[PDB]
Write a protein that binds this DNA or RNA. Structure first.
Length: 125
RNA sequence: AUUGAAAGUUUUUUUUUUUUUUUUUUUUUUUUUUUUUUUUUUUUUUUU
């Protein structure tokens, strides 16, 4: 399912999204385009929306970069064997040889691969 | 029917924070509301 939105905002007074602002300090220059004039970059929109969503959710897990607890490898294996898309993501990232169809291949695993898998689990959750 | 092929240069990151166009600056200094004009003229304290 795809949800499409066309949001409009009745901002009080004005806004300003600068960039570069040349050198020599003095005035503050809002970012230009050259042809279209001025715009708000999509990255700024995404950052503002992420901030608002983080405020809304108020998740303690998200506050500490999802690095506050140790995730058991058994749980990781259970999710991997239970979620096909998660398994596909893990295989596409850490490598097909490292992660087989069924199992984690602990012998080939090392510190950084394990950390990557734990971070992927935390962020996917 | 190319020696021969099939892969998105992709994900991810808010150009943001610090700063009161502020202090000082009395719409006042001068100019007599005076100036020419008689409250005046007419009338018997009185008759059969």
């Amino acid at each position: 399912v795809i949800q499409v939105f066309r949001l409009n905002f009745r901002l009080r007074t004005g806004f300003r999204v600068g960039g570069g602002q040349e050198v020599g300090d003095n005035v503050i220059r809002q970012l230009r385009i050259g042809v279209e004039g001025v715009m708000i970059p999509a990255s700024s929109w995404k950052g503002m929306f992420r901030r608002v969503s983080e405020i809304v959710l108020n998740s303690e897990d998200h506050f500490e970069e999802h690095s506050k607890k140790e995730v058991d490898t058994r749980t990781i294996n259970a999710l991997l064997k239970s979620d096909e898309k998660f398994r596909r993501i893990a295989i596409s990232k850490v490598g097909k040889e490292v992660i087989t169809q069924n199992g984690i291949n602990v012998d080939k695993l090392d510190s950084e691969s394990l950390s990557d898998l734990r971070r992927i689990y935390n962020e996917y959750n």
